[PDB]
Symmetry: C2
Subunit: 181 residues, 2 copies
Amino acid sequence: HARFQKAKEQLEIRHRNRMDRVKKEWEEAELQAKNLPKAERQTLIQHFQAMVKALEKEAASEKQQLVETHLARVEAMLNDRRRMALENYLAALQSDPPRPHRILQALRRYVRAENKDRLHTIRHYQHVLAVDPEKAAQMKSQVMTHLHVIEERRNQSLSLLYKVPYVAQEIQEEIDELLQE
Amino acid sequence: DVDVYFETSADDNEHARFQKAKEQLEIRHRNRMDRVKKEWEEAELQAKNLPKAERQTLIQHFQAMVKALEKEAASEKQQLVETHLARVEAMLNDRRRMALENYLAALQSDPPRPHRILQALRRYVRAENKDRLHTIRHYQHVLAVDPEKAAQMKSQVMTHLHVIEERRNQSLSLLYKVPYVAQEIQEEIDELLQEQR
């Protein structure tokens, strides 16, 4: 997250310096053309305007490359941590005999990882909602489906506690705490 | 390479320098596009054991990545074109202005030499033809690759062609104020005025 925040800052600076430089150069070109007819001055300014629009399209495009690269990496980290937390939960659930509090530890790490997947999904989606309504509209179906998969994955892991009903009551209140975020 | 083009003053080698900078940009973008495509595909490989929905979101990011890279390329390409067009237009306008001045000056000289006026009129009309031909040609280029962008600039293309035609006819009408000269080069004038039709 920090590495992305740092590249994001360098990108904004880079975009600012370039926008300022090009603007200053083209305006310098407009000054040298102050003695030219009104029509020649307009088409030059029109070129400057097209120049600005291409620069803004370039800037947004480079920002999108950063974001797509960032999102993919975060999703990889969230999916991998969840996998390892799930394995440790299964292994602790199959141990002989099963100690209810080593299982509680493993269940905590898994459920909280799912919450972290949940938190990142909602946060990024709300971010897109605030700045780009149509992009949010496009990802809307997939956002909901993923949140539903997280919920199913949760309940699915919890259903494994039914297969050991005794342990489930010895940590029922901690589980209820965990489930209340 | 390409960046140097933007800080190189227009001259007679502007067109060539632009053509090579245009080519270097297309190559650099393809090289960048290829490198990135390879990297993400390895990430698609490393995620092959994942559920079908999770690989979809990864592939979907790659698609969004390609779309961003293509927007970056076209954007950098348009910057090149806008810079080039301004440079060509300034050289064309300066050449027309100098030729029109020499034509006016030759027209008011005492006495007016009919072949000095002809010589000057040739440089002007041919400068006007170079502007006209450039306008049509760039338009055809945009038509060939981006029909929708061409349709939007068409109106300005037509107006620019109209101004050229107006400047032409007005400059030619000034020959009526010098009845002697106009008769001795009428046939040269008629040839000149039909050039590049």
